[PDB]
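User: For a benchmark we're assembling, each entry needs the component sequences followed by a predicted structure for the full assembly. Here are entry 17's components. Please fill in the structure.
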Amino acid sequence: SILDSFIKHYPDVKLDALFWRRLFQLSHFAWTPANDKKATSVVRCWHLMKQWYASKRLRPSVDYETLRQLYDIMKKTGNFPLGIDVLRSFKPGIERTRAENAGKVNNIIIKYQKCIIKELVNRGRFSAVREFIDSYGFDRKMTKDLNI
Amino acid sequence: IPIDVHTLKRIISSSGMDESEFSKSISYLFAKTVDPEPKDVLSLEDLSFLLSKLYTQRFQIRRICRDINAKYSEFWFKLFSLYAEKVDAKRNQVNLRNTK
Amino acid sequence: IKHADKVPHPEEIIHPFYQPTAIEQFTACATEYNPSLLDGKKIAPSLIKHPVSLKTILVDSKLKFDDIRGVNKWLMEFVARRQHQRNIVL
Amino acid sequence: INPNGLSNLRYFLQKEDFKGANKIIQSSSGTETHNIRTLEHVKNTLKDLVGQERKVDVVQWKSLFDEHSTFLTINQSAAYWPLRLEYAILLNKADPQFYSDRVFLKDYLLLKKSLGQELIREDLIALLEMVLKTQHSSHSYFNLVKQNRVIIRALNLFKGLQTEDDGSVVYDEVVISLLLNSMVADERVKLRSLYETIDHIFQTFGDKLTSGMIVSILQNLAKIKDWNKLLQVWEAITPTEGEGQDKRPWNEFINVINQSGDSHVISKIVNNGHLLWIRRLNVNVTPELCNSIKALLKTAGMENSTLEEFLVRGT
Amino acid sequence: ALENLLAAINNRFFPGRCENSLHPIVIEQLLSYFIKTGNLNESKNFLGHLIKKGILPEATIINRYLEAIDVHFDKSTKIFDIRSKFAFIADLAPIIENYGTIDLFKFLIPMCRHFDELCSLLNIIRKSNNAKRAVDSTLPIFIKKVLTFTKDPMINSGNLSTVFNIVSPIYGQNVPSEFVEKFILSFALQGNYTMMAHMIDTYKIKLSHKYQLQIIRALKNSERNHALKNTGAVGYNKEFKKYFIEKYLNCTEREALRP
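Assistant: Structure for entry 17:
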């Protein structure tokens, strides 16, 4: 409330990516899985930054392992998966202009591919050129379905 | 570059301990690096210049020395000791007041 | 969409005497709309690695900078190689 | 050889009698000097027309002095070229819509290069001058884009050989500063080439860096308010440290930061590093410089003893 | 038998490096033998090894390299070529610019597919002590290549003027009339009427007679090519060209043979 009352009574301020990242971490320590198994704080803040000044080209890369942690827990959104709701975060920073290679960024994206699950028709996986679409799943699911 | 490939790393780890031989060690450090100036052994202005360079590259040296991360702190302590004793040496001279 | 013909690094490109003058490097750096080298003539035999064929296929490339960041680094890195090759005596 | 040339053409040229004014110039021909006369004093009449504020006869004038384009005038092009440059700029300042900068390029820069005469350095300066004189439509980050397009193609005319420019115009001062100022107006519109341009300036032009471009870079960077990279370029010195004192203009930095000069950034730059290198590199502080820093710190923090009296007498 | 010997030696002595470690003279001899046997792959490998060892091969051997490359794929430069012709030039970059025989320059004249591509080429000839004889040998082929590119009269006109002002330092002054007329022949096309008008008075050729059927042939080609290029003929139109038509014309041809 303090910050909100501040920025509606003040011209726009340079809300850096650190501000949002620290806000996400604070919300993570705030939301309680036992009291509420629905991370309202993190998602609400995520919407806040997405609509902050319409998020004018808000495409940073600050190693959001918090999003990965949130995705680890599932079925906490309007749609049936929680992860695919988090998949909306993909559109900001698709180009990965700064995240060319190396670091933990590329390591979490290749680790982020677990968001896909089940054998369905996913032809909207533009992602980035030269993607290993044929290195996960397949034999681990069809044979199990047959055995059932 | 002030940090080198195991060279400054070998020096900051020293031959077990800095001992009194580290003064010439840092002398060679700012000798091979930029501004060699092979005319003196130690000068306060040179150390003041070198300190900013060390601060900027302190990120990388810690990265490489993250495995050891033990003699690193002692090396910084030794650098402080040399800085303090040089300051005291200047302080003995009156110049401007006493302990400016 | 088909491949965009992404520019390769100067190591891939092989040319004996192509020395890029300072004026052309300034031209490349001052361009903000799809910069390019040799005016995108598609004449640059490149030891490039295709995403599915990483076998150092040799092919002339457009050398058209899709973006603007890092192009300057590309020019300094290329000129450094050419100066090094020129310097060596036989 | 008509003696009436350059003495009566003006009266029929103000009224634009077409054939009435063209007959006299048609009768004027012969020697090379007469050819100059036919192509001379037309600039004076055109300037008089500009004094009369008449900018709808671009095509008629173009046909007029293209019909009588003598070969002898091109034969002594060394002295004729300034006359054509005056003509072309005058047309540009008179209704440039029909005489867009591209028309200037095709009719002057292209033809001059074809004819083989060497390009004098001043051509770029006038090009930038008249390009920044007027701007086109689409005033949403596209004035800069198309301005970059026209300028880059204009200078693309001489991406070949030296053309008697071993010290190419790039190495000439002023032209680079003006082009940098033209390719971005202010913080309202910022292009994606700034960082590449002045980084290229730093790496390559550091050997022959001059006060001109090192000053304009700061002046332009102030407009975009890009302090985070401004401090990188300032801290970056192509020679090893302050080899031969400090080449970077400290006074100009004080003057530019005095302008605008956000409280937070000046506080960070004064106290949080980015200072005390003056005493490290032992540069001489001009008395005017000392006064400027005194005024700055009077507006900025701690003008009394620290960082104002310090670095001046060595304290 | 020689190939068997080479394989046995390489495999037994040390597998991590080929015969390139031998004395350079033997490597040069091996290069000569391979070229005489047309083993381009081995030739390029050994030549690349020689350059990294700080050895300058003899001019004749490099020329033999060039002709072996030419004969391997029946030459016949085309769109498909050049790129295939590449991959055998990387090790030769040190010998271009620094050093460089005339056969090398002539070999690279055609592979310059762009004017700016050969701008550096002509620059390094002008920086070489062999500039005069190399220019003497390769100027006509250079003229053909530069004319092949830059179809538009304006851009090739500027290119030719640039080559003119950069070759004028070469030979100092009094360039042989053979190149003067050869340049004019390739220059009579398109435009730049004014600078050739200067050129005739610049040197002492002053020859308005038939260039053994070449002057009128050049005019014929220009008017034939006028439909394709220079259609507007801004400055090159007869309204302007009339003065030059009536200026240089010998009595042998009756008003340019009444064209």
